[PDB]
Write a structure and sequence with these properties.
homodimer, about 130 residues, alpha+beta, endopeptidase fold (from Nostoc punctiforme), elongated, binds heptanoic acid, transferase, Lecithin:retinol acyltransferase
Chain lengths: ~130, ~140
Amino acid sequence: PIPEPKPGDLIEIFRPFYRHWAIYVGDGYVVHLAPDILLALTNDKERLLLGVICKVAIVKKELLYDVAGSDKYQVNNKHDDKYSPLPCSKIIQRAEELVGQEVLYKLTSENCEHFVNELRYGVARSD
Amino acid sequence: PEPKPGDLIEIFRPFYRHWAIYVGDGYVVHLAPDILLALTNDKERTQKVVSNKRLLLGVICKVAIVKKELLYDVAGSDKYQVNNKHDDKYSPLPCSKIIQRAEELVGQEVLYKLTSENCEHFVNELRYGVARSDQEFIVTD
Ligand SMILES: *C(=O)CCCCCC
Ligand SMILES: *C(=O)CCCCCC
């Protein structure tokens, strides 16, 4: 068949409707930014302050074989012509660190208040 | 007792306080919750279609949008007050400047694009250390 990826290789997965990217980190595993959609209403403290948390993605570490499923993929380090990749041991160290990190927005009344204060005064308060 | 242009309005909704800024003639500008997932179609191949498969860039998660609406509609049946809370700390901007800046933001959205491109920026940042603009929800220009 086709040789295994090397550590640090970018993987482009051809899903039926879209292309999914990941990075190889060794021993069968990739790190990738995966969809993880959750909306939750919460009660912050400090009368409670109602809030809305929207999570849309999370960085995961999973086996390439599971992420690819039945979809085909290729190694595609297509920016090696213009950027230096980092040393491969550094790439994987940095990838492992991000695992569990989430993309999320927290919406409370504070956001709206900072928004209008910025218009009235030109000032972003830090409380 | 009508608000003046540039006045901050605090609306007492049953579970939270909703803020707005008065811009004149019955209207406020405010950041309104508008929570939406929408699929976003792949356009790159638009003018050079060879399958009929609809292709996707990704999904957009929108959380809020800046609107301009009538105070009467935004308040609904909730009570509200003028509350220029920090006038004792520093002075407001000139009132015409406040309204100019408020009108310009109308239509801006708070969102995150979970797209191929975004994921490619993420892995590029790991492989090359090239920093990225997009790792978090953004506000559009
Ligand atoms: C990144 O490659 C993940 C993009 C997922 C889009 C889901 C619609
Ligand atoms: C801004 O005033 C809107 C804030 C919405 C809070 C929802 C919990």
